[model samples]
Target: MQIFVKTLTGKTITLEVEPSDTIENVKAKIQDKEGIPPDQQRLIFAGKQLEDGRTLSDYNIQKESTLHLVLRLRGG
Candidate 1:
């Protein structure tokens, strides 16, 4: 399936991951595409922090769906 990933900086990246793809897997893919390490990345969906090992199905993601990956910034 294909999923559209968009960043807070207006960067959009698309990926063709399997339906069984986990959130962790998506993180790695996004990191590779955006050059941001997973450890330093924060993926928020529907105002929830995407936990590791959570599959797309676990989050109600469907085939050919678009997922938004917003980068969390820590500052005052």
Candidate 2:
């Protein structure tokens, strides 16, 4: 699988990812890719925020996807 992390500056970091893995693990990967720092790195697929201690399989939205990086808590 693949993942896309887009910043507000129009810079997007696309990386190859495991189709099945830890949700937070992927989050950590994002940070490691270029210092995203999962701590404040909120996410959104359709709506609502996500949590840790979960895997991509748990969310069930597999394959290539666009994960909106709404960085701040105020709807980035």
Candidate 3:
């Protein structure tokens, strides 16, 4: 299945994934494509946060589905 990822900056990326692929797996792809670390990525799908432990199918993600990406903020 293919999923769309939209960044806070309005940048978007399309990822080809398997149903068994974990949310973390998607994060890894994001890291590779956008240079954003997985630890810094917050993924939201269907108006809910996606856990790293869950698979795409677990969230009922379908083709053309969009996942919002929010970058984590750090403080001193």
Per-model clash counts, in order, read 0, 0, 0
Candidate with the larger TM-score of 1 and 2: 1
Candidate 1, 1-76: lDDT as tens digits: 6666777777555678877778787788666755766677777666677677788777778766656676654455
Best model number under lDDT: 3
lDDT per residue for candidate 3 within 5-73, as digits (tens), equals 777877555567788888777678667766656776787766777777787777677887787878744
**Which of candidates 1 and 2 reaches a greater lDDT?**
1
Per-residue lDDT tens digits for candidate 2, residues 1-76, read 6666666546765666676767677677756755646676777667777666676776786676677765543333
Off by over 4 Å in 3: 33-37, 72-76
lDDT of 1: 0.70
RMSD of 2: 4.4
Which residue pairs in candidate 2 collide? none
lDDT of 2 at 39: 72
> lDDT of each structure?
0.70, 0.66, 0.72
